[PDB]
C-alpha cells in the first residue's frame, strides 16, 4: 500500500486560499490521503518556487487526523500518478498553456469528484482552481482552528486588539475596489449608518479595512472613531501580513460590513461575527444574525 495525496494549490488572496484548502482537506480526510499545502507562486512571495505557507503560518504536520506536508518538500518529493484532474497526466510541454477555461473545467471536475460515492483511482488529486463553497462550513472552521499564524503576525494582532478593540464594540468594514465611486462611497456610508444604529454593549468604534487611501480618508472624515491598521520581496510579505492582520481582526468585530459579500476576505468574519451587513434586492441592505 502506497501513500496517496491531495495537493492544495492556490496563489490568490488568503480567504480564497484558506477556503480552497478546507475543500482539499475534506477530500483528503474522506479518502485517506495526505494533504499537501502548495502555495508556490503566491501573489505575496516574490520567489516563484518558495512555498508561501511557512512564510505566514507555523509548521503543521497534521490537521484533525489528516497528515500534512506544508513546506519546501514540495520541491523535493515526486507526488505519484496517475493524476486527477486528467489534465495533470499530460506531458509538461503540454501543460504550459493553462487558460481560465481549463481551470474552470477542473473546478467542475473536482466538484463532481467530491460529490461522488467512490474515491478516485488517481494516486494524487491536484487542486489548482477555486474551491470556495466546495466543502462544509465545519471544514472551513477546522482549518482556521488548526493552523496558527506566525508569532510576529500574532503579536501585531494582539497589540492592535488591546489598543482599539478591548473595551469596545467594533464595527468592521471591508471595502474592496466619477459616478461609480460616488455611489459606492455613498453605499458604504449607508451601511455604516445602519450598523451604527444597532445597539451594542460597549462604546462603538469603526475598523476600516480598505486598499484605497482615498476611501480611508473619506470614511474617516465622515464618521467618528474610525481607525485602520497603519501601512520588494519584503514588501510582498508585508502585504501578506497586513492582509492577514485585517482578516483576523475583522473576525473579532461585533458587526461586519462586507463590501462586497462575494469577497472571501471576510469569510472568516462571516463564520464568527454576531451580525453581518451587506447589500443583497440590489440597492437594499440586509442584516444577517449569525447563524
List the binding residues: 14-16, 44, 174, 176, 246, 263-265
Nearest in space to 139 (alpha carbons), one of 246, 53, 64: 64
37 membership: H or E segment, kind and range: strand 34-38
Rg (CA), the chain: 20
- Same structural domain for residues 249 and 267? yes
Please, which residues bridge with residue 171 across strands? Answer: 206, 255
- Same structural domain for residues 10 and 83? yes
Which of residues 149, 173, 191 is at a domain's end? 149
Q: Could you give the CA distance from residue 210 to residue 177 in angstroms, rounded to a whole number?
A: 8
Q: Could you give the CA distance from residue 103 to residue 130 in angstroms, rounded to a whole number?
A: 8
Question: Alpha-carbon torsion 144, 145, 151, 153, what sign?
Answer: positive
Q: Could you give the CA distance from residue 165 to residue 249 in angstroms, rounded to a whole number?
A: 9
Q: Could you give the CA distance from residue 269 to residue 276 in angstroms, rounded to a whole number?
A: 9
- Same structural domain for residues 40 and 116? yes
- Same structural domain for residues 3 and 133? yes
- Same structural domain for residues 143 and 157? no
- Same structural domain for residues 100 and 192? no
Nearest in space to 81 (alpha carbons), one of 69, 91, 71, 73: 91
* Distances 101 to 54, 97, 104, 214, 265 between C-alpha atoms, Å: 31, 11, 5, 36, 24
What domain range is 11 assigned to? 1-149
Walk across the sheet containing 169-175 and list its strands.
226-227, 204-210, 169-175, 255-259, 275-279, 285-289
Number of C-beta neighbours around residue 199 at 10 A: 6
- Same structural domain for residues 186 and 223? yes
- Same structural domain for residues 43 and 166? no
Which domain CATH number covers 19?
A: 3.40.50.11340
Please, which residues bridge with residue 210 across strands? Answer: 175
Q: Could you give the CA distance from residue 190 to residue 259 in angstroms, rounded to a whole number?
A: 12
Give the CA-trace dihedral at 93, 94, 95, 96, to 10 degrees.
60
List the binding residues for GDP: 14-16, 44, 174, 176, 246, 263-265
Number of C-beta neighbours around residue 286 at 10 A: 12
Only one residue has cell 467594533, namely: 170
Which domain CATH number covers 180?
A: 3.40.50.11350
Resolution to 1 decimal place, in Å = 1.5
- Same structural domain for residues 165 and 237? yes
Domains in the chain: how many in total? 2
Amino acid at each position: 500500500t502506497k501513500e496517496r495525496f491531495v495537493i492544495s494549490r492556490r496563489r490568490t488572496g488568503f480567504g480564497d486560499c484558506l477556503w480552497s484548502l478546507a475543500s482539499a482537506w475534506s477530500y483528503a480526510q474522506r479518502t485517506g490521503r495526505t494533504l499537501v499545502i502548495d502555495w508556490r507562486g503566491s501573489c505575496y512571495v516574490e520567489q516563484p518556487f518558495s512555498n508561501a505557507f511557512p512564510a505566514f503560518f507555523e509548521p503543521v504536520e497534521d490537521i484533525a487526523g489528516v497528515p500534512v506536508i506544508c513546506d519546501d518538500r514540495v520541491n523535493q518529493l515526486s507526488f505519484p500518478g496517475p493524476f486527477f484532474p486528467r489534465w495533470w497526466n499530460r506531458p509538461s510541454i503540454d501543460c504550459i498553456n493553462r487558460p481560465d477555461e481549463q481551470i474552470f473545467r477542473e473546478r467542475d471536475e473536482l466538484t463532481e469528484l467530491f460529490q461522488a460515492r467512490e474515491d478516485s483511482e488517481a494516486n494524487t488529486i491536484v487542486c489548482d482552481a477555486c474551491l470556495m463553497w466546495r466543502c462544509s462550513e465545519e471544514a472551513e472552521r477546522l482549518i482556521f482552528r488548526n493552523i496558527k499564524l506566525r508569532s510576529e503576525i500574532r503579536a501585531r494582532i494582539d497589540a492592535l486588539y488591546e489598543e482599539h478593540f478591548s473595551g469596545h464594540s467594533i464595527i468592521g468594514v471591508h471595502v474592496r475596489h466619477w459616478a461609480d465611486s460616488e455611489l459606492a462611497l455613498h453605499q458604504v456610508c449607508m451601511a455604516i449608518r445602519k450598523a451604527k444604529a444597532l445597539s451594542y454593549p460597549k462604546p462603538v468604534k469603526v475598523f476600516l479595512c480598505t486598499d484605497s487611501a482615498q476611501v480611508l480618508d473619506q470614511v474617516s472624515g465622515l464618521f467618528p472613531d474610525v481607525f485602520a491598521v497603519p501601512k520588494s520581496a519584503e514588501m510582498g510579505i508585508e502585504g501578506g501580513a497586513s492582509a492577514l492582520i485585517d482578516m483576523y481582526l475583522l473576525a473579532r468585530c461585533a458587526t461586519v460590513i462586507r463590501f462586497p459579500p462575494t469577497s472571501a476576505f471576510t469569510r472568516y468574519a462571516r463564520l464568527l461575527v454576531p451580525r453581518i451587513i451587506e447589500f443583497d434586492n440590489p440597492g437594499h441592505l440586509t442584516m444577517i444574525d449569525n447563524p
